[PDB]
PDB file of C-alpha atoms in Angstrom:
ATOM      1  CA  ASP A   1     -48.357-244.443 113.014  1.00  0.00           C
ATOM      2  CA  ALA A   2     -50.413-246.197 116.013  1.00  0.00           C
ATOM      3  CA  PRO A   3     -50.853-244.901 119.796  1.00  0.00           C
ATOM      4  CA  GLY A   4     -48.706-247.091 121.993  1.00  0.00           C
ATOM      5  CA  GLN A   5     -46.544-248.390 119.191  1.00  0.00           C
ATOM      6  CA  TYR A   6     -43.395-246.881 120.651  1.00  0.00           C
ATOM      7  CA  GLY A   7     -44.395-246.942 124.394  1.00  0.00           C
ATOM      8  CA  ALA A   8     -44.892-249.652 127.050  1.00  0.00           C
ATOM      9  CA  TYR A   9     -46.594-249.733 130.526  1.00  0.00           C
ATOM     10  CA  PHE A  10     -45.172-251.949 133.060  1.00  0.00           C
ATOM     11  CA  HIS A  11     -47.013-253.242 135.957  1.00  0.00           C
ATOM     12  CA  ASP A  12     -46.916-256.260 138.490  1.00  0.00           C
ATOM     13  CA  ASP A  13     -43.251-256.683 137.775  1.00  0.00           C
ATOM     14  CA  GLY A  14     -43.658-256.996 134.022  1.00  0.00           C
ATOM     15  CA  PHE A  15     -40.953-256.346 131.301  1.00  0.00           C
ATOM     16  CA  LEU A  16     -40.154-256.624 127.601  1.00  0.00           C
ATOM     17  CA  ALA A  17     -37.096-258.209 126.265  1.00  0.00           C
ATOM     18  CA  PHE A  18     -35.446-257.627 122.723  1.00  0.00           C
ATOM     19  CA  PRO A  19     -32.779-259.487 121.096  1.00  0.00           C
ATOM     20  CA  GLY A  20     -29.327-258.265 121.629  1.00  0.00           C
ATOM     21  CA  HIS A  21     -29.148-256.925 118.101  1.00  0.00           C
ATOM     22  CA  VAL A  22     -31.512-253.979 118.955  1.00  0.00           C
ATOM     23  CA  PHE A  23     -28.340-252.534 120.606  1.00  0.00           C
ATOM     24  CA  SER A  24     -25.543-253.802 118.355  1.00  0.00           C
ATOM     25  CA  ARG A  25     -22.057-252.611 118.845  1.00  0.00           C
ATOM     26  CA  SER A  26     -18.866-253.080 116.903  1.00  0.00           C
ATOM     27  CA  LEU A  27     -15.547-251.529 117.414  1.00  0.00           C
ATOM     28  CA  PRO A  28     -14.233-250.696 120.853  1.00  0.00           C
ATOM     29  CA  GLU A  29     -14.746-246.941 121.881  1.00  0.00           C
ATOM     30  CA  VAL A  30     -17.467-246.384 119.205  1.00  0.00           C
ATOM     31  CA  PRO A  31     -19.750-243.778 121.130  1.00  0.00           C
ATOM     32  CA  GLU A  32     -23.083-245.032 122.234  1.00  0.00           C
ATOM     33  CA  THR A  33     -26.274-243.384 123.191  1.00  0.00           C
ATOM     34  CA  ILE A  34     -29.264-244.308 125.191  1.00  0.00           C
ATOM     35  CA  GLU A  35     -32.299-242.024 125.085  1.00  0.00           C
ATOM     36  CA  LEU A  36     -35.756-242.618 126.452  1.00  0.00           C
ATOM     37  CA  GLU A  37     -38.728-241.009 128.108  1.00  0.00           C
ATOM     38  CA  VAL A  38     -40.087-242.296 131.472  1.00  0.00           C
ATOM     39  CA  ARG A  39     -42.829-241.619 133.769  1.00  0.00           C
ATOM     40  CA  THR A  40     -42.992-243.333 137.095  1.00  0.00           C
ATOM     41  CA  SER A  41     -43.494-242.921 140.845  1.00  0.00           C
ATOM     42  CA  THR A  42     -41.108-246.000 141.452  1.00  0.00           C
ATOM     43  CA  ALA A  43     -38.141-245.202 143.705  1.00  0.00           C
ATOM     44  CA  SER A  44     -35.928-248.029 142.976  1.00  0.00           C
ATOM     45  CA  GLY A  45     -35.967-250.247 139.801  1.00  0.00           C
ATOM     46  CA  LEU A  46     -34.531-251.423 136.492  1.00  0.00           C
ATOM     47  CA  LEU A  47     -35.306-249.282 133.379  1.00  0.00           C
ATOM     48  CA  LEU A  48     -32.776-250.963 130.970  1.00  0.00           C
ATOM     49  CA  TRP A  49     -30.301-253.829 131.185  1.00  0.00           C
ATOM     50  CA  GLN A  50     -28.005-255.520 128.565  1.00  0.00           C
ATOM     51  CA  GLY A  51     -25.503-257.990 129.962  1.00  0.00           C
ATOM     52  CA  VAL A  52     -23.825-261.109 128.696  1.00  0.00           C
ATOM     53  CA  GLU A  53     -25.421-263.897 126.762  1.00  0.00           C
ATOM     54  CA  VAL A  54     -26.531-266.790 128.612  1.00  0.00           C
ATOM     55  CA  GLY A  55     -23.818-269.274 128.875  1.00  0.00           C
ATOM     56  CA  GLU A  56     -20.914-266.793 127.757  1.00  0.00           C
ATOM     57  CA  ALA A  57     -18.488-265.877 130.406  1.00  0.00           C
ATOM     58  CA  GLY A  58     -16.400-265.212 128.259  1.00  0.00           C
ATOM     59  CA  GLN A  59     -18.083-261.944 127.458  1.00  0.00           C
ATOM     60  CA  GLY A  60     -17.050-261.543 131.083  1.00  0.00           C
ATOM     61  CA  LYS A  61     -19.756-260.221 133.383  1.00  0.00           C
ATOM     62  CA  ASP A  62     -19.785-256.946 131.437  1.00  0.00           C
ATOM     63  CA  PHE A  63     -23.179-254.914 131.329  1.00  0.00           C
ATOM     64  CA  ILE A  64     -24.735-251.602 130.486  1.00  0.00           C
ATOM     65  CA  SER A  65     -27.761-250.416 132.612  1.00  0.00           C
ATOM     66  CA  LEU A  66     -30.260-247.468 133.372  1.00  0.00           C
ATOM     67  CA  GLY A  67     -32.480-247.480 136.428  1.00  0.00           C
ATOM     68  CA  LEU A  68     -33.759-245.647 139.337  1.00  0.00           C
ATOM     69  CA  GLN A  69     -32.104-245.442 142.909  1.00  0.00           C
ATOM     70  CA  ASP A  70     -34.203-243.544 145.501  1.00  0.00           C
ATOM     71  CA  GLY A  71     -35.823-241.998 142.413  1.00  0.00           C
ATOM     72  CA  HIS A  72     -32.680-240.754 140.933  1.00  0.00           C
ATOM     73  CA  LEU A  73     -31.659-241.811 137.432  1.00  0.00           C
ATOM     74  CA  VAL A  74     -28.707-244.089 137.345  1.00  0.00           C
ATOM     75  CA  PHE A  75     -26.452-245.006 134.460  1.00  0.00           C
ATOM     76  CA  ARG A  76     -24.181-248.098 135.556  1.00  0.00           C
ATOM     77  CA  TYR A  77     -21.768-250.029 133.248  1.00  0.00           C
ATOM     78  CA  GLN A  78     -18.952-252.469 133.689  1.00  0.00           C
ATOM     79  CA  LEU A  79     -16.420-252.985 130.953  1.00  0.00           C
ATOM     80  CA  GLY A  80     -14.324-255.698 132.688  1.00  0.00           C
ATOM     81  CA  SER A  81     -12.223-253.493 134.958  1.00  0.00           C
ATOM     82  CA  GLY A  82     -14.592-251.926 137.535  1.00  0.00           C
ATOM     83  CA  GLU A  83     -18.127-250.360 137.407  1.00  0.00           C
ATOM     84  CA  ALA A  84     -19.025-246.797 136.742  1.00  0.00           C
ATOM     85  CA  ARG A  85     -22.134-245.274 138.232  1.00  0.00           C
ATOM     86  CA  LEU A  86     -23.423-241.867 137.274  1.00  0.00           C
ATOM     87  CA  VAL A  87     -26.457-240.527 139.330  1.00  0.00           C
ATOM     88  CA  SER A  88     -28.760-237.560 138.572  1.00  0.00           C
ATOM     89  CA  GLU A  89     -28.692-234.727 140.993  1.00  0.00           C
ATOM     90  CA  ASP A  90     -32.610-234.898 141.419  1.00  0.00           C
ATOM     91  CA  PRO A  91     -35.028-237.523 141.690  1.00  0.00           C
ATOM     92  CA  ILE A  92     -37.289-238.074 138.637  1.00  0.00           C
ATOM     93  CA  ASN A  93     -40.032-240.294 140.155  1.00  0.00           C
ATOM     94  CA  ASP A  94     -42.618-237.728 140.371  1.00  0.00           C
ATOM     95  CA  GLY A  95     -45.057-239.364 137.939  1.00  0.00           C
ATOM     96  CA  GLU A  96     -44.395-236.775 135.190  1.00  0.00           C
ATOM     97  CA  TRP A  97     -42.485-237.393 131.901  1.00  0.00           C
ATOM     98  CA  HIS A  98     -38.837-236.972 131.724  1.00  0.00           C
ATOM     99  CA  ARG A  99     -36.263-237.496 129.043  1.00  0.00           C
ATOM    100  CA  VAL A 100     -33.111-239.271 130.042  1.00  0.00           C
ATOM    101  CA  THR A 101     -29.965-239.446 127.972  1.00  0.00           C
ATOM    102  CA  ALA A 102     -27.183-241.617 128.692  1.00  0.00           C
ATOM    103  CA  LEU A 103     -23.836-241.310 126.523  1.00  0.00           C
ATOM    104  CA  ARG A 104     -20.585-243.328 126.584  1.00  0.00           C
ATOM    105  CA  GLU A 105     -17.212-243.184 124.886  1.00  0.00           C
ATOM    106  CA  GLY A 106     -15.241-246.033 125.969  1.00  0.00           C
ATOM    107  CA  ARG A 107     -14.714-245.727 129.741  1.00  0.00           C
ATOM    108  CA  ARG A 108     -16.139-241.998 129.958  1.00  0.00           C
ATOM    109  CA  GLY A 109     -19.846-241.446 130.370  1.00  0.00           C
ATOM    110  CA  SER A 110     -22.471-238.713 131.012  1.00  0.00           C
ATOM    111  CA  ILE A 111     -26.120-238.491 131.811  1.00  0.00           C
ATOM    112  CA  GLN A 112     -28.488-235.723 131.061  1.00  0.00           C
ATOM    113  CA  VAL A 113     -32.051-235.337 132.465  1.00  0.00           C
ATOM    114  CA  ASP A 114     -34.738-233.121 130.685  1.00  0.00           C
ATOM    115  CA  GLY A 115     -32.081-231.569 128.393  1.00  0.00           C
ATOM    116  CA  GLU A 116     -30.223-230.031 131.620  1.00  0.00           C
ATOM    117  CA  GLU A 117     -26.564-229.848 132.557  1.00  0.00           C
ATOM    118  CA  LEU A 118     -24.545-233.066 132.041  1.00  0.00           C
ATOM    119  CA  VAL A 119     -22.997-235.215 134.992  1.00  0.00           C
ATOM    120  CA  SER A 120     -19.838-237.224 133.896  1.00  0.00           C
ATOM    121  CA  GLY A 121     -18.241-240.315 135.367  1.00  0.00           C
ATOM    122  CA  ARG A 122     -15.726-242.847 134.399  1.00  0.00           C
ATOM    123  CA  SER A 123     -15.151-246.530 134.892  1.00  0.00           C
ATOM    124  CA  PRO A 124     -11.538-247.540 136.115  1.00  0.00           C
ATOM    125  CA  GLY A 125      -9.071-248.616 133.303  1.00  0.00           C
ATOM    126  CA  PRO A 126      -7.907-250.343 131.474  1.00  0.00           C
ATOM    127  CA  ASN A 127     -10.930-251.885 129.657  1.00  0.00           C
ATOM    128  CA  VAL A 128     -12.696-249.749 127.064  1.00  0.00           C
ATOM    129  CA  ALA A 129     -15.515-251.909 125.537  1.00  0.00           C
ATOM    130  CA  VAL A 130     -18.636-253.682 126.769  1.00  0.00           C
ATOM    131  CA  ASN A 131     -18.634-257.275 125.590  1.00  0.00           C
ATOM    132  CA  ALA A 132     -22.441-257.835 126.242  1.00  0.00           C
ATOM    133  CA  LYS A 133     -24.580-259.332 123.543  1.00  0.00           C
ATOM    134  CA  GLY A 134     -27.359-260.627 125.652  1.00  0.00           C
ATOM    135  CA  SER A 135     -31.040-259.658 125.495  1.00  0.00           C
ATOM    136  CA  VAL A 136     -31.933-256.007 126.273  1.00  0.00           C
ATOM    137  CA  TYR A 137     -34.516-255.784 128.999  1.00  0.00           C
ATOM    138  CA  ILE A 138     -36.857-252.841 129.462  1.00  0.00           C
ATOM    139  CA  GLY A 139     -38.819-252.032 132.690  1.00  0.00           C
ATOM    140  CA  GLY A 140     -38.034-255.180 134.819  1.00  0.00           C
ATOM    141  CA  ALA A 141     -37.308-258.826 134.159  1.00  0.00           C
ATOM    142  CA  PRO A 142     -38.765-262.178 135.451  1.00  0.00           C
ATOM    143  CA  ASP A 143     -35.908-262.313 138.106  1.00  0.00           C
ATOM    144  CA  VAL A 144     -34.273-258.885 138.301  1.00  0.00           C
ATOM    145  CA  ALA A 145     -31.955-259.671 141.056  1.00  0.00           C
ATOM    146  CA  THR A 146     -30.466-262.831 139.256  1.00  0.00           C
ATOM    147  CA  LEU A 147     -30.254-260.947 135.983  1.00  0.00           C
ATOM    148  CA  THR A 148     -28.415-258.083 137.572  1.00  0.00           C
ATOM    149  CA  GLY A 149     -26.146-259.806 140.005  1.00  0.00           C
ATOM    150  CA  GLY A 150     -28.269-258.306 142.868  1.00  0.00           C
ATOM    151  CA  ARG A 151     -27.587-254.615 141.731  1.00  0.00           C
ATOM    152  CA  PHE A 152     -31.309-254.145 141.113  1.00  0.00           C
ATOM    153  CA  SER A 153     -34.094-256.000 142.885  1.00  0.00           C
ATOM    154  CA  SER A 154     -37.262-255.058 140.717  1.00  0.00           C
ATOM    155  CA  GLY A 155     -38.458-253.245 137.573  1.00  0.00           C
ATOM    156  CA  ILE A 156     -40.467-250.090 137.511  1.00  0.00           C
ATOM    157  CA  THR A 157     -44.373-249.590 137.531  1.00  0.00           C
ATOM    158  CA  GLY A 158     -44.846-246.865 134.837  1.00  0.00           C
ATOM    159  CA  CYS A 159     -44.001-246.102 131.231  1.00  0.00           C
ATOM    160  CA  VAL A 160     -41.079-246.152 129.067  1.00  0.00           C
ATOM    161  CA  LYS A 161     -41.294-244.656 125.478  1.00  0.00           C
ATOM    162  CA  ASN A 162     -39.242-243.313 122.431  1.00  0.00           C
ATOM    163  CA  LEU A 163     -36.309-245.740 123.292  1.00  0.00           C
ATOM    164  CA  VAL A 164     -33.237-244.970 121.151  1.00  0.00           C
ATOM    165  CA  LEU A 165     -30.282-247.233 121.376  1.00  0.00           C
ATOM    166  CA  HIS A 166     -27.497-246.251 119.305  1.00  0.00           C
ATOM    167  CA  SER A 167     -23.789-247.219 118.848  1.00  0.00           C
ATOM    168  CA  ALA A 168     -22.479-244.685 116.195  1.00  0.00           C
ATOM    169  CA  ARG A 169     -20.752-247.114 113.808  1.00  0.00           C
ATOM    170  CA  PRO A 170     -18.877-245.105 111.169  1.00  0.00           C
ATOM    171  CA  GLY A 171     -21.126-244.591 107.967  1.00  0.00           C
ATOM    172  CA  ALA A 172     -24.228-246.128 109.730  1.00  0.00           C
ATOM    173  CA  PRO A 173     -27.681-244.696 109.479  1.00  0.00           C
ATOM    174  CA  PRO A 174     -29.390-242.381 112.142  1.00  0.00           C
ATOM    175  CA  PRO A 175     -31.086-244.442 114.843  1.00  0.00           C
ATOM    176  CA  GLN A 176     -34.851-244.522 115.382  1.00  0.00           C
ATOM    177  CA  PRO A 177     -37.213-245.192 118.464  1.00  0.00           C
ATOM    178  CA  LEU A 178     -37.555-249.000 118.984  1.00  0.00           C
ATOM    179  CA  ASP A 179     -40.873-250.416 118.084  1.00  0.00           C
ATOM    180  CA  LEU A 180     -41.686-251.923 121.555  1.00  0.00           C
ATOM    181  CA  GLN A 181     -45.038-253.528 120.531  1.00  0.00           C
ATOM    182  CA  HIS A 182     -43.894-255.492 117.667  1.00  0.00           C
ATOM    183  CA  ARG A 183     -40.176-256.240 118.075  1.00  0.00           C
ATOM    184  CA  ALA A 184     -39.996-257.913 121.485  1.00  0.00           C
ATOM    185  CA  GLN A 185     -38.843-261.501 121.911  1.00  0.00           C
ATOM    186  CA  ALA A 186     -40.228-262.122 125.525  1.00  0.00           C
ATOM    187  CA  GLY A 187     -42.367-260.143 128.008  1.00  0.00           C
ATOM    188  CA  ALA A 188     -45.253-260.211 130.537  1.00  0.00           C
ATOM    189  CA  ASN A 189     -47.385-257.766 132.440  1.00  0.00           C
ATOM    190  CA  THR A 190     -47.014-255.110 130.002  1.00  0.00           C
ATOM    191  CA  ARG A 191     -49.415-253.344 127.516  1.00  0.00           C
ATOM    192  CA  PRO A 192     -48.850-250.354 125.015  1.00  0.00           C
ATOM    193  CA  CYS A 193     -48.409-246.979 126.755  1.00  0.00           C
ATOM    194  CA  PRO A 194     -50.218-243.980 125.124  1.00  0.00           C
ATOM    195  CA  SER A 195     -48.999-240.675 125.835  1.00  0.00           C
TER     196      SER A 195
END
């Protein structure tokens, strides 16, 4: 009902972080979807990260992530037996809005940009489930390299909006975009992004 409720602008290495339960999972191999809209000129940086709870390895070093690499969308995950990395054909860091959708069914993944053709990928077997219950970071983090194990080194400057995180637990209701302005547990150098 308010401009900016579902969008956030990141600058000067800002970020928001949400409790892990915004991206709750359950049973291994339950399908999961990430969808968001992004506008940025940033070539390399983190869009979304969820890794293991602080203090829990354990939970192994599993993670799910979305980001930009030389402007291309990248979807990268680790279930405990090797990383998958899916990369868009084209760069998306043109400062115009794009919709990006990342889907996973156990080891198998796909990405789609602007409702165009799928690109698929797989992580090596046998592991099928992500064990990560840490906070969900959007747009960056206070120390991106430490958070991501060096895989990313910065966030983005730009907006993320209409963030849908959904593990399709049997019987559960439809997902809804996350209220970025009222549900974060931590953040800095961010403001509502009208669009």
